[PDB]
Design a protein around this ligand. Structure first.
Ligand SMILES: Nc1ncnc2c1ncn2[C@@H]1O[C@H](COP(=O)(O)OP(=O)(O)OP(O)(O)=S)[C@@H](O)[C@H]1O
Ligand SMILES: Nc1ncnc2c1ncn2[C@@H]1O[C@H](COP(=O)(O)OP(=O)(O)OP(O)(O)=S)[C@@H](O)[C@H]1O
Ligand SMILES: Nc1ncnc2c1ncn2[C@@H]1O[C@H](COP(=O)(O)OP(=O)(O)OP(O)(O)=S)[C@@H](O)[C@H]1O
Ligand SMILES: Nc1ncnc2c1ncn2[C@@H]1O[C@H](COP(=O)(O)OP(=O)(O)OP(O)(O)=S)[C@@H](O)[C@H]1O
Ligand SMILES: Nc1ncnc2c1ncn2[C@@H]1O[C@H](COP(=O)(O)OP(=O)(O)O)[C@@H](O)[C@H]1O
Ligand SMILES: Nc1ncnc2c1ncn2[C@@H]1O[C@H](COP(=O)(O)OP(=O)(O)O)[C@@H](O)[C@H]1O
Lengths: 531, 548, 562
């Protein structure tokens, strides 16, 4: 009985009346009782994630026992925990002496048993103690999923989080826990609104206790700013939003803000490809509202283009818009993932960044550098699980869109491309993706905005010496004349800009007479053009 | 009496009776006794999969020892197990030396027993082993023995492999019916021999991860536990285990009963639930597959080798997908290769990949690599009218005996697959000249080996609202986040027929058109409001487009 | 107190007679002795292939020292069996193994030069690093310690020769495996120890049989212990039989029983029971091949002449090639033979020579040289014969193959040799090679031989035995072929309890249809199935025929009907 200084107790808390009302998980408590009532492979271990309530499952089990629902072999069983706060090995003998002389009626419960697993294992092999456990997936797999001599005594129980409405309904046993400081009146409106905005800041947290973390963050931030008598849903929203957003981020949905337009950056930054851009805009209006399916990447498509049409430019253009930053995208080339020697390297080369900053869109410019094993990797990613890491820490793909702007059948127009797509992408890269689009090559109409943005960039580059260019439409079209060449692309235009303008400009800049502050015009000549 | 700290005593524990009965397996015990009684290369090692009964063999050896059956040379000796988990950077070898010290101080015939020694190895034990003071009964698995106790051993001259594969269904039923009083006393309800047979057979048939001797007892113990917990029908019956195995695997309990005639009788609309029309095709395919399972034909031939043709988009691969969904419990079972780039004489061996050391060797062959794994698939040959006249030699050898040889030298068995050769001949002809065309195009004796050469038929304009309803029933779960329902109107249903058929691609745009139109025209209002999860989401057709 | 917890005493172990009586091997022991006694660098190293008696030489030197049979500067030298696995076991700190080894070295060099040391499997002295196994050099190349060693050639090359400054300090004494007579002498020396360990007797003829049989059949191991293993196994097995089972010695046929129990080869002396089978063979083999009497007696003579002990023990057990018309029974005779002497009609190794139309695909049955894609995989044929070295190899239709595959079996035949990429040889010395063809096919026995003489080359036609010519099918044998096929079908109809009652006109019609003179009996299994099995399934799926009903068949005016 000396365990009172070594271990806590639970068979008396519910008897005296000290407990918390946990509701639900009836099937889980049933599973626990059934597994513990076995001849072999008994004493389960509640596997899950930190902050789901495995302790809640155990205390609910104790409550159910003391109220009385158990079979004959469970006559209240004196359930008891173990305080790891008694730490050396000379005292483990003392705490196990009362379990050895026990008659199998003093079953224990260790929390986070992957720390322990020498001293207890032989006793477990003989079966004088049950030792209900609790651990997490990664750690469980790391420690006791490789020693098959101990997988003989441990039948795992998988636990998930309760639903959103379930958390809402269970919240009524928390009305007085935290908000007893500034006496702000709790309202059911803000209560149901708190967990509603669960993916405004971070999706690494969970529902049952991390929603409470959110609520307490909100209470603290209110009591810090207003130092009102009521809690406000949009105010909790501003709490959770003022850090994944500088002006408290985006407000309520109001899709007319950024996504209805979709071309302010795209249509004026990527000249051409109008059909592809309109199509992907329609696609992201149909998709970017949680309005496609259960947890998918919520975006996947492909389209076609040769060199010199602006595929990389569209990729880097949508970056500054889709999430209003530079790292809103990751572009992966498989110039390394081409053989089976490397398919394991990304499980992980990408995982570091994609887990640290899950605010990026995944890009694979070409599959003419890829292997059919990354095919199955991404297939399992799509709709059959978010991700599985070789170490065990899994990272969801919530704000990631799948793109391929390939030159797969660019020589052909509409039929060769479609046949080559249906062929080269064997595993289901057709049925679960979205539409496959096309490009609109450099056209005499689509050259004016090109030259305009090029000259704008050259000007902002020249602004460090306080020079400005007066570009007239004569030269604006004389360059466009000999810069069409729709086999190579805009790089002839850029090189011609550099040569014609910059070579002479940089000769005269050190030849005097163009001292800083001046302004230079453009004047077409028969074969050249002067400044 | 020195360091009994990190071990057990299977003999002393047997002196009281804590151990189980070990019924059966009376040959491996004698083989172990025989190897343990040599002069050199003694101390055997048991080899088998997990949970087959190696520890059980050692327990039975100890029990026959304590009762008295072995020769006197082995009699009067004890056994000890060892724990590779409680020991294990460094100081593990110090502990190992501490143990082998107690062994050398025993200096007798106190046999040891190590479990999964391929974690240990090395050259620390070999001197002590090749001197005659310890005996080493091992236990491990074949593949790990081959990688750890074969490559760097140099003591493979000291180890003898004993094989224990796994029992059969009958031996497992005997194991169970002998190991029956234990659970009947632990929980205590009742157990029927019918339930034992059901456990063995269901486990063997559906559970493929684990193996018989313990995979079977899991079901019995779980059934007893759940029956005991139910009392919060005083016996466990053969139906009282279908429930447990269904809870385990997923398939409902109705399917996990008679499934050899009850499943052939369902080759009715259970296929037609997925494919619409084509009743002659469905009947012919169903009957052809139904008579192959009878059991009177030669056992080396695929399960079905029919080819069908006609217009595209009329449901030609949908029948294949549905047939794979019903028979093989998966719709990702058809492997589809395009017979358009197999036109040259050099690209015929591209679907095997013949030699070692050449360009395409580790990529296997397109046909043989997809069947060596999942040897229960369905094979489609799109556009067979464009193949070089040497593919047919391979495709004719495969269906004369269900075997083939890939490049690595392996042999793959085709006698559980279903072959299907699509085509598109007869763009204009209905049923009269396409037959002569497909007879003249291919060799005449090649068709003589196939099954029915049934010809698909056009889609009745009446039989298109069927496909429309299938599309809408599928779409009835895309707006499942906010429970927003869908509106239905027969004119709009028959509106998609004309502007979606395009009678040169069958019904290919019936998916893209519907999804783009409705999804895009709705996404705006699904956020703007004007409809919530209590409304039909009113929709109809404008003179030009589909109105909201 | 340092070299007594990290070493045992081989000489003290020899004094109590806990060693074995080394027999022979005087050259190697003399060389070890005369190298162990020079001025500097007196470190011999026994080297050789595994199992040929390298430790026995050192134990013999120990027994000789104890007996006093050595030169004057070797008497009372107390050789010591050092071990390193026990000095590296507990040491996890800076400089904890260094002093442990330094104490041993100081104790060896403290006493006078009488501590001859013995490290077995010395390739393990190269590690211990983290400057280790390297402190020993100054004493090695000065004659301070003697260090008799022993290791295998492969381990030597891999570990020690990478340290060309340390190899210099060792003298290689090459140990080669002994011959059959030397092994017989060794066994005669060691017999009386096994005769005491087990409670049985062992016969000198049994020893001779062990040393001889273990040399023809077990070709992956080496002799001195390859031969002892058989004797040990047979003795233990006979003792296990005598006990526990309610004429007392091992003889030259128990060894045959063991050497056939593993390696599968039927080596022995034709114990009664199968001699009757071998005598009654041309008809027990004729229960499946009708006709071709000349091509069955040849195979039967090969098999009998092989197992009777009169045949060249270094050449395959038969290298026939039989060719003739189409659908005559060539492949079927090969399969019937494989079924006769294996009982598993699919236990043979057949390769389809119609797939070798391209010169480069020979690498399927050879492998790939070092440095190419599939190198450690091996070759199909080589790896198929290395295990189960008793099969029947079959080359079907060997005229479609490019005429450069006729050059590899040019020496597979006539010697039973073939080497793969790794350069190791397998022996086709117990197989039966059979390669069929279809040259001629419409000529007499003279113009069909002229096609062989024009397709193959003289040094290839000269390697193989009888070139058998299969004859044409007589119209009186087709009935028996139909009986064979119908019996096969009936035996298939045994998962039910169906039967058949085929009539004489039915059999005659079946024999008449599908025997065309150009394609032999080829279109007959297909016809039997088409005309019986289909409407036997139809009339079984739709009831009206149930298990038990012996259904008859007749010849109703048109094509056959039930
Ligand atoms: N439609 C376009 N809009 C904007 N820039 C374009 C366009 N077409 C070409 N360019 C420019 O042409 C150059 C080509 O680079 P990018 O288009 O970004 O790379 P890319 O399109 O992937 O070409 P490849 O295929 O890699 S050679 C860049 O300076 C682009 O800005
Ligand atoms: N012949 C047998 N008689 C009785 N029980 C048996 C027999 N064979 C197997 N079992 C049971 O099958 C189960 C398997 O136990 P083990 O023998 O420990 O399995 P294993 O082959 O040792 O694999 P490991 O060691 O767990 S990885 C036990 O419950 C045994 O009691
Ligand atoms: N000349 C010999 N005289 C007597 N017995 C011998 C002789 N040579 C070998 N043997 C015996 O045959 C067996 C060979 O064992 P070892 O000599 O230890 O093999 P080895 O030469 O050490 O090869 P490795 O690499 O150590 S496995 C032992 O049982 C020896 O007693
Ligand atoms: N003498 C025979 N006895 C029994 N069956 C025979 C006989 N001759 C032919 N057959 C049958 O004929 C069929 C084919 O015979 P095979 O010998 O396999 O063909 P083949 O002799 O290899 O000729 P090819 O050129 O290789 S097709 C099989 O069903 C055999 O059973
Ligand atoms: N179903 C539930 N009923 C009551 N409280 C719950 C429930 N789920 C989560 N909780 C809350 O979470 C806490 C228990 O979490 P805990 O089991 O300690 O998480 P973990 O086991 O992951 O460390 C309790 O304080 C409780 O308020
Ligand atoms: N009998 C049918 N039942 C159901 N859908 C059908 C049927 N016939 C055609 N379809 C539909 O027609 C379209 C044609 O696609 P697919 O099955 O791939 O045919 P194809 O072989 O012509 O490519 C699909 O949407 C398919 O569902």
């Amino acid at each position: 009985q000396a365990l009172q200084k070594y271990s806590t107790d639970l068979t008396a808390r519910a008897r005296e009346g000290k407990l918390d009302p946990v509701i639900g998980r009836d099937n889980e408590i049933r599973r626990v009782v059934q597994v513990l009532s076995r001849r072999t492979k008994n004493n389960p271990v509640l596997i899950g994630e930190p902050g789901v309530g495995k302790t809640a499952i155990v205390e609910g089990l104790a409550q159910r026992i003391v109220a009385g629902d158990v079979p004959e072999s469970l006559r209240d069983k004196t359930i008891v925990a173990l305080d790891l706060g008694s730490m050396f090995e000379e005292r483990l003998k003392a705490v196990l002496d009362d379990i050895k002389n026990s008659a199998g009626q003093i079953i224990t419960f260790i929390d986070e048993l992957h720390t322990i697993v020498n001293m207890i294992k032989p006793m477990l092999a003989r079966g004088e103690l049950r030792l209900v456990g609790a651990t997490t997936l990664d750690e469980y797999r790391k420690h006791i999923e490789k020693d098959a001599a101990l997988e003989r005594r441990f039948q795992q129980v998988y636990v998930g989080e309760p639903s959103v409405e379930d958390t809402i309904g269970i919240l009524r046993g928390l009305k007085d826990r935290y908000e007893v400081h500034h006496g702000v009146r709790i309202t059911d409106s803000a209560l149901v609104a708190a967990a509603t905005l669960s993916d405004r800041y971070i999706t690494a947290r969970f529902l049952p206790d991390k929603a409470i973390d959110l609520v307490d963050e909100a209470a603290s931030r209110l009591r810090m700013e207003i130092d009102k008598e009521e809690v406000g849903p949009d105010d909790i929203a501003d709490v959770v939003s003022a850090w994944t957003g500088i002006p408290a981020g985006r407000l309520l949905e109001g899709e007319t803000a950024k996504l209805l337009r979709m071309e302010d950056e795209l249509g004026k930054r990527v000249i051409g490809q109008k059909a592809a851009v309109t199509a992907v805009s329609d696609a992201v209006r149909r998709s970017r509202a949680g309005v496609s399916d259960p947890n998918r990447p919520t975006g996947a498509f492909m389209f076609l283009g040769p060199t010199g049409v602006g595929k990389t430019e569209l990729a880097k253009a949508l970056a500054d818009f889709l999430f209003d930053d530079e790292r809103a995208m990751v572009r992966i080339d498989m110039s390394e993932y081409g053989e089976k020697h490397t398919v394991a390297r990304l499980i992980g080369q990408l995982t570091e960044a994609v887990r640290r900053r899950p605010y990026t869109v995944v890009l694979f410019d070409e599959i003419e550098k890829a292997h059919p094993d990354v095919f199955d990797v991404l297939l399992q990613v799509l709709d059959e699980g978010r991700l599985t890491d070789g170490h065990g820490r899994t990272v969801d793909f919530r704000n990631t869109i799948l793109i391929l702007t390939s030159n797969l059948g660019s020589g052909g127009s509409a039929e060769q491309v479609l046949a080559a797509v249906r062929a080269t992408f064997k595993p289901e890269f057709i049925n679960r993706l979205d539409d496959v689009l096309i490009f609109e090559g450099l056209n005499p109409e689509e050259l004016v905005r090109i030259v305009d943005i090029q000259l704008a960039q050259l000007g902002k580059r020249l602004a460090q010496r306080r020079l400005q260019l007066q570009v007239s439409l004569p030269a604006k079209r004389w360059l466009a004349q000999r810069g069409f060449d729709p086999v190579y692309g805009a790089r002839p235009l850029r090189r011609l800009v550099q040569q014609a303008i910059g070579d002479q400009l940089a000769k005269m800049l050190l030849a005097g007479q163009v001292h800083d502050g001046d302004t230079v015009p453009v004047n077409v000549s028969p074969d050249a053009d002067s400044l």
